[PDB]
Design a binder for this molecule. Structure first.
Ligand SMILES: Cc1ncc(C[n+]2csc(CCOP(=O)(O)OP(=O)(O)O)c2C)c(N)n1
Ligand SMILES: Cc1ncc(C[n+]2csc(CCOP(=O)(O)OP(=O)(O)O)c2C)c(N)n1
Ligand SMILES: [Mg+2]
Ligand SMILES: [Mg+2]
Lengths: 801, 801
């Protein structure tokens, strides 16, 4: 930790290149319109919300960036990637409005978006696909997402895919937000990777929402201490220009001492007092410091400002950041929260108009008018000139990539469609499918395989020899090895999955990890990825409750699909078979990166269990994509049922079908369900359409088109709700679902499948139970099956075990 | 960063208090039994799994701790709280066996739990309630959990609730695991809170699973740099005692330079070679370093070891940490991964028996026999003597607390059971309920209100004046204000929620935060809390997709209940009314902290929307607890439907009920569903039991004892699955569910409820639709209703919007 003063002394401060007074006129209009936007929303009394205090404290920081640093998307690269702090969005809207990119009508619909001509509260690409780029409102996610975006830009350069050298990634953070573990938890990575294209800009107004970040301490010193410790270049923007004469005049060093010893809480109290209270409780702490302002009027003292409000000090910091190589830079900008808002942070509005010399007359003020700069005006000319020199306007977003990729055909995955000689797993199928893609000339170098330390567990090690590990194992390595860091891997996957938009360079990430540590562990990033329109694959390896058998409670995933079905634009599959994996991956590839350019990402759970992989039935492709297809029909004269299974448990349903027929003369239709979720969604879509078109012929869910009315039983390696979600659409009156509800534990697969009551013996007993409720067989036969299979009818419910 | 040598020079090292030769014998027997345990499991060929290399690298560190530092649970306090590294559990089991706490049959059932008297793969209290305490295998979670556990212990002391001053929290971490953002993301908190009762022990073997943490860097220096910068006391245990002579006679300072400049990758290469290789490639880098070992044999050079394997260096580090105050200490223990296994770091294990001089012939070795120390042997006596001096054995766990609390009765919440005077929200109801608890002499000081920065948003500010904010706003403050850090807040909640077991001191936490940032953001910790048998309350505030209307996409929660239903021992509720909040909170209190001592925690979503709160219907209490009860029946002669709602949408369902009756002559039963999830679980339980007992009187799902067979419609502020989950158990053939599937966006509550198709209008159309399909009313009536209500039947499905 250094003294509590600017890192860049005035003697090393470059001349400011802009027109300060003109820039302030423009900035005042931006401040005014931002406030107007929020107040007009408030007018409506619809509890719309919206903030003002934060943008007021960071406005000047952003203003210097828009006038002298931020590069917009251009023909060479995507421009600077700015992770705008979420709640200062009203300031971004105000500026875009002044630049003529948004209309008054849109500002007037700030926070009312359902009817189409509105503005989102925060940066949501999914809601404003041509405007926002990075969802930052969910705090903590901005900072780590930025780190990995910066890393991904270096990767694209190193791999010879795109020259991103002129791009800077800016993460605009709040100081309270730095308490999120995700905010500082990955900062050493920027040093390991020498991310000199990354700048963290922390607005140190010393406050969170409901109080100071650390009133009894010095949050700026805390941040400096740990970032410096992590190898970052730290630039503190502490004081404005008026302090420069005062500091060089302090030959005693007591002013510095005074500044260093004062704590956050006290600096914040001074901010509320007055110029007299200041010379008294601050400058008046020591005679030498009190003597420095002895010849100062109380008004001249109150004029002393924080560095984050002085364009000259701000500019020096971003310039130094821009010049720095070898490591990332973090700028700690000292500001006043609710700057110039006196009242809280009609008289209040008048105070603001006056404080910032806003060009709004007394006759118009009550109309809360927006201010505009006419073409020909000095303000209009300068606003646009500065931006034209930096390549246009931002933020802006391109929702589709321009190039046409020549994707592999399903035929290209032919070997995976045939019966397998060796027993393999769906994870081995996934790796083989990836190898098929790495043979495609068009996309082979666009693929981005990602792992979180573990590769061998997923049989990814063979790929290493072929494409190597990215390690600026060299700078040309293709695989991203992110270590024991699922959030980080997820952020790399997200940067890759959105490169198609950000850099007009489609990249296709496959991130494979232990499924339990996916949505459960990085779920907020997964939701953010949907907002960001990510197009990529999440492969949840070692999936299924009973299948990663020895690992136990915190590893056995019988519910990731329940978490994944909550994401609207995540498409989820739980395939059993080698060929389904191939069809599913080919289709996802086509949908996301073919002409359709569908904005969805995929989640495929894969397995670590080897078994016989049969050939794909002729014509089953569409059913596989839609979610279900009839695999086999077994003959039986005594009764008929339908049996459904997915992932590793389909095996055992299929065994149950043999037993039902051989031992009980009960025929069955047997379905592989590659996606209960896609089927449930299709069902809801049909039910919804039907309800809204009462005069039309009811539409039929795909699952109801595949199935008949015979009593049905489903079993999967996931909790019962996974299969129960399609109940409403299943055309049979009786539908019984078995599942792995309950905490996992270590044992053999056989023991866990019996414990969770999903194995063949339970499927059989479940099927006979339905046939008994129909009278087709005597209840006694079900009782006898239970004893026959050594099923303990009285063991505790697995959910409670 | 300091030089790459021990922090503690030999000169300041205390004399080792133990019997080194006897300790080594005992330690070798533990290493052996640990290996035997895993190899026997392997032989079964059931893919059980299990690690050996990591415990070998950390065995000596744990050994010094077990013999000289770890305090077991005792009469005065819970002893030291040791977060053992997940996957060195075989070593803990081996020591426990040697201590006579586990039988051979248990070791022989390592990773086969299902039949009882087995052992979990990792620390899972839910599975071994009297043994393990803290679930750590989900790497990342142990370090942050440990930080907040240490802070919680300080809180307990500061609040005068329990003298925890003699307890130390030890977090045993891997160096690769430190990459998880959660591992270092909160390390600054330990400094803010002066956690001198916290010791992080990082096993620096330089390796994660598939390779080095940073082969081209120095992971120990990275860790030292950031922890030092975060204000921690860092103690490096780099080199064993054989190096002391070398460092002492090297007046050139070259050995140190050489140690400093060598990177992790090269150090790992040395360990894979031999003495000659080290002499040439390490010491041979400089004439002076070559000179230091010129008269050493290659064997003597090869004997040089890493500090983490020398009991004397280990002891000095732990003793120093024990005397360090004002901040937490992190010990960076340098070790060799695959220690003593060398060749592969039945007989290929005789290398291990010879390496550690294990008393087993080259003929019994194939039988993988366990070593024990008979009562009376020098080893047995010493093993137990050292532990007795430390109060017994650990880990161990007490499942229930001993004291009896005198809990508030439901009548104590009587004011909340009456009609409220003004329109309030369920969040206001929650705060009023907490206030009733704060008046109970028995539990008032055991309550732990927890917030993540925002308090005003949840109306928690009034409490600040009453019970204060914990700030060691002073150290007697009761509310934990964790800032913008949901994971940290969750970790404080977890420490509080398990204090009943850990410290035999029941504390009752209530963590309120924005519901979107609950399971979605800290879901892996919520799963771990379940494993840890947490008993507390998670209050998801500002919940419901349409209800936190202006906030938009990353805030509007219409799915946390889908995430929460995945945790077996989380009981979830979405009440509509203040009296339901009261009944649920009272019941939860009695279940978890009353004589039942049920191992479940609660999740209650609450709202930020005010509306009329009617009085509780007489006798509705149990129905509120169970999940559903009938509110009223409205007459109508043209048809009959059932209408269900929960949370903020119930009042709109009631509006629909009035519209149906008054405009269409359609009567209704109206139900408030307080918990769709508990009803679904009850139904699954009933059906499971019935089908396993085909001849017995079947169990009737609770929901089926409340609802009848008239067509039903449900609507809630959550995606359709939340209400669909009970379909199988609803006793009506038509059950239509409305929900908030799709990404949220900013608008008025009215606009969002119409966009998400969940408002009164849609419920009416849904109900009329069912009647028309029964030919009870003309299909035209539905079409006209759609028109009358300005419903756009062709707008896109909200799930895709
Ligand atoms: C994960 C998450 N938790 C909580 C919030 C709610 N929130 C909105 S503004 C705010 C305070 C932000 O303080 P700080 O980061 O210091 O920024 P400032 O407004 O001072 O610039 C919080 C906690 C959020 N957006 N995301
Ligand atoms: C969140 C999470 N991700 C992945 C794993 C899988 N895993 C088991 S051991 C291991 C490597 C651990 O390396 P390190 O932390 O360095 O410990 P060591 O065994 O070297 O002492 C990993 C990643 C896990 N347990 N938890
Ligand atoms: Mg702040
Ligand atoms: Mg390691």
């Amino acid at each position: 930790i250094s003294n509590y003063i600017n890192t860049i002394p005035v003697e090393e401060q470059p001349e400011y290149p802009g027109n300060l007074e003109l820039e302030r006129r423009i900035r005042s209009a931006i401040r005014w319109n931002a406030i107007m936007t929020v107040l007009r929303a408030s007018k409506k009394d619809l509890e719309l919300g919206g903030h003002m205090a934060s943008f007021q404290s960071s406005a000047t920081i952003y203003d210097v960036c828009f006038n002298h640093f931020f590069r917009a998307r251009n023909e060479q690269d995507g421009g600077d990637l700015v992770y705008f702090q979420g709640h200062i969005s009203p300031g971004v809207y105000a500026r875009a409005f002044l630049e003529g990119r948004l209309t008054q009508e849109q500002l007037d619909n700030f926070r009312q978006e359902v009817h189409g001509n509105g503005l989102s509260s925060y940066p949501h690409p999914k809601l404003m696909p041509e405007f926002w780029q990075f969802p930052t409102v969910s705090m903590g996610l901005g900072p780590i997402g930025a780190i990995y975006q910066a890393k991904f830009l270096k990767y694209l350069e190193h791999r010879g895919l795109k020259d991103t050298s002129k791009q800077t990634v800016y993460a605009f953070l709040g100081d309270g937000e730095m308490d999120e573990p995700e905010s500082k938890g990955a900062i050493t990575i920027a040093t390991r990777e020498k991310l000199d294209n990354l700048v963290f800009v922390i607005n140190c107004n010393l406050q969170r929402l409901d109080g100071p970040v650390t009133g009894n301490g010095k949050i700026i010193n805390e941040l400096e201490g740990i970032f410096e410790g992590a190898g970052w270049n730290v630039i503190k923007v502490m004081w404005g220009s008026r302090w420069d004469e005062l500091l060089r005049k302090d030959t005693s060093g007591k002013l510095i001492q005074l500044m260093n010893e004062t704590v956050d809480g006290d600096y914040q109290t001074f901010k509320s007092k007055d110029g007299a209270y200041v010379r008294e409780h601050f400058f008046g702490k020591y005679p030498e410091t009190a003597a420095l302002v002895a010849d100062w009027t109380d008004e001249q003292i109150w004029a002393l400002n924080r560095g984050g409000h002085d364009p000259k000090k701000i500019y020096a910091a971003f310039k130094k950041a821009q010049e720095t190589k070898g490591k990332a830079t973090v700028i700690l900008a000292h500001t006043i929260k609710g700057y110039g808002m006196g009242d809280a942070a009609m008289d209040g509005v008048r105070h603001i108009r006056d404080r910032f010399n806003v060009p709004v007359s007394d006759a118009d003020i009550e109309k809360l008018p927006y201010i505009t700069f006419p073409e020909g005006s000095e303000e209009h000319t300068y606003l646009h000139a500065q931006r034209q020199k930096l390549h246009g306007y931002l933020p802006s977003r391109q929702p589709n990539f321009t190039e046409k990729l020549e994707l592999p055909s399903l035929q290209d995955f032919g070997a995976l469609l045939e019966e397998q000689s060796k027993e393999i797993s769906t994870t081995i199928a996934f790796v083989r499918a990836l190898n098929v893609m790495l043979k495609n000339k068009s996309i082979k170098d666009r693929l981005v395989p990602i792992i979180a330390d573990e590769a061998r567990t997923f049989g990814m090690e063979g790929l290493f020899r072929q494409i190597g590990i990215y390690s600026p194992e060299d700078e040309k390595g293709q695989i991203l090895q992110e270590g024991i860091n699922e959030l980080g891997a997820g952020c790399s996957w997200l940067a890759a999955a959105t490169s198609y938009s950000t850099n007009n360079l489609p990249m296709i990430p496959f991130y494979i990890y232990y499924s339990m540590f996916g949505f459960q562990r990085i779920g907020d990033l997964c939701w953010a990825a949907g907002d960001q329109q990510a197009r990529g694959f999440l492969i949840g390896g070692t999936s299924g409750r009973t299948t990663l058998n020895g690992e136990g409670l915190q590893h056995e995933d019988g519910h990731s699909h329940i978490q994944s079905l909550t994401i609207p634009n995540c498409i989820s599959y739980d395939p059993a078979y080698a060929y389904e994996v191939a069809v599913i991956m080919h289709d996802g590839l086509e949908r996301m990166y073919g002409e359709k350019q569908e904005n969805v990402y995929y989640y495929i759970t894969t397995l670590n269990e080897n078994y016989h992989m049969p050939a794909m039935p002729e014509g089953a492709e569409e059913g596989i994509r839609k979610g279900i297809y009839k695999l086999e029909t077994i003959e039986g004269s005594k009764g008929k049922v339908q049996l459904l299974g997915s992932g590793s448990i389909l095996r055992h349903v299929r065994e149950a079908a043999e037993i039902l027929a051989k031992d009980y003369g009960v025929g069955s239709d047997v379905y592989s369900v590659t996606s209960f979720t896609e089927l449930a969604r299709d069902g809801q879509d049909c039910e919804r359409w039907n309800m809204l078109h009462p005069l039309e012929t009811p539409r039929v869910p795909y699952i109801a088109q595949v199935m008949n009315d015979a009593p049905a039983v489903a079993s999967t390696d996931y909790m019962k709700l996974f299969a129960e979600q399609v109940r409403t659409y299943v055309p049979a009156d009786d539908y019984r679902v078995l599942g792995t509800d309950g905490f996992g534990r270590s044992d053999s697969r056989e023991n866990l499948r019996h414990h969770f009551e999903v194995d063949a013996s339970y499927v059989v007993v479940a099927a006979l139970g339905e046939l008994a409720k129909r009278g087709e067989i005597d209840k006694k036969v079900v009782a006898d099956a239970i004893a026959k299979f050594n099923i303990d009818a009285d063991k505790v419910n697995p959910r409670l075990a």
